[PDB]
Write a protein that binds this ligand. Structure first.
Ligand SMILES: NC(=O)c1ccc[n+]([C@@H]2O[C@H](COP(=O)([O-])OP(=O)(O)OC[C@H]3O[C@@H](n4cnc5c(N)ncnc54)[C@H](OP(=O)(O)O)[C@@H]3O)[C@@H](O)[C@H]2O)c1
Ligand SMILES: C[C@]12CC[C@H]3[C@@H](CCC4=CC(=O)CC[C@@]43C)[C@@H]1CC[C@@H]2O
Length: 323
């Protein structure tokens, strides 16, 4: 039965599929691969697709989605598509224009979810990481509560079914939740999460407010230089994950994805390979015991692959606080 799939009810009443397809790939990888990969993901059973303006693939991702609706493989209501607002468009007057630009590239009428991508703001313009004459990034001073109000207007206009955040810490979440006149809470906080960085504290805070944590780099990340240090440990070579995989005749990736589902996290998984795409959907075919979950909880070791430390400095940089 393919018209049903596992989802979670968001705090605005909409439903989010619990397994999402990651679409980012390094610039070297031709865009024809993103188009094909999304088609393969939909074919395999993924109903949640994650992208962003800065991934430079929304034209291809949108074409894939539209092709799979037009060939009868899926209906628009059974696709949950996420886009993200880049940091050069945090000013409240620029939020709707950025969403409209994404929608025009996608050729879709609405996104299911629109997120604030990263909480540090940069100067507006066509450059996505604007830099001065000495190579210094041009930061901008924006009140994210004002940005949030503009996100709420996008939801009221129907351009985004749901709105949320990404890369927010405890303080930043509280700032939105305590905003005077708040209309809509964020439905989710999309952050790095895997057995080496399991986010227990931030996850519990999100649970206490009915905010869903959406895990990125759940398989150990793309490991793309300069974003990820090559000396960071390779998640999927972990001996505990590999031993659990061998016991169950599964793979370390499947163990890492199932861990997130059973702790109440919505998990993303990027793959541009036909067999790994099909493999990843097998997360719904087995369950982990409480002892196995505890063993995986024991791997926590403070390994953050994606620091985005070129944006460090401003008070909104999210990774200096404990959580
Ligand atoms: N909000 C943010 O700031 C943010 C940041 C990072 C990522 N994201 C989102 O999260 C997605 C996922 O994370 P990521 O892109 O960092 O990666 P990831 O999902 O952690 O994956 C890592 C790598 O795992 C490989 N892989 C996939 N399935 C596998 C399997 N079954 N067995 C072995 N290897 C497998 C992939 O290679 P192949 O493609 O060759 O299979 C991929 O290069 C991104 O694409 C993006 O949509 C968001
Ligand atoms: C789009 C881009 C390459 C991909 C970058 C992006 C800035 C944000 C970013 C952070 C990562 O850790 C992954 C790669 C990305 C998504 C860069 C801004 C200019 C550059 O061309």
């Amino acid at each position: 039965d393919d018209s049903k799939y596992q989802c979670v009810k968001l705090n605005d009443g909409h439903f989010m599929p619990v397994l999402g397809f990651g679409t980012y790939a390094p610039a070297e990888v031709p865009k024809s691969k993103a188009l094909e990969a999304v088609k393969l993901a939909i074919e395999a059973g993924f109903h949640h697709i994650d992208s962003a303006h800065v991934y430079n693939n929304e034209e291809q991702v949108g074409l894939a989605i539209r092709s799979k609706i037009a060939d009868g493989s899926v209906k628009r209501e059974d696709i949950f598509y996420t886009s993200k607002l880049w940091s050069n468009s945090h000013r409240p007057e620029l939020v709707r224009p950025a969403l409209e630009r994404s929608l025009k590239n996608l050729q879709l009428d609405y996104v299911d979810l629109y997120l604030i991508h990263f909480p540090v703001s940069v100067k507006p313009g066509e450059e996505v990481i604007p830099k001065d004459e000495n190579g210094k990034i041009l930061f901008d001073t924006v009140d994210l509560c004002a940005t949030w109000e503009a996100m709420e207007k996008c939801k009221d206009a129907g351009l985004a079914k749901s709105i949320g955040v990404s890369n927010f810490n405890h303080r930043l979440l509280e700032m939105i939740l305590n905003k005077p006149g708040l209309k809509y809470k964020p439905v989710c906080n999309q952050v790095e999460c895997h057995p080496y960085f399991n986010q227990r504290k931030l996850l519990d805070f999100c649970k206490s407010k009915d905010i869903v944590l959406v895990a990125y780099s759940a398989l150990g990340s793309h490991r793309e230089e300069p974003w990820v240090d090559p000396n960071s440990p390779v998640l999927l070579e972990d001996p505990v994950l590999c031993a659990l995989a061998k016991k169950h005749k599964r793979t370390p990736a499947l163990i890492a994805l199932r861990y997130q589902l059973q702790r109440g996290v919505v998990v993303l998984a990027k793959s541009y390979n036909e067999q790994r795409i099909r493999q990843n959907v097998q997360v719904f075919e087995f369950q982990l015991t409480s002892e196995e979950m505890k063993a995986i909880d024991g791997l926590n070791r403070n390994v953050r692959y994606l620091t985005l430390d070129i944006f460090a400095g401003p008070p909104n940089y999210p990774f200096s606080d404990e959580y």
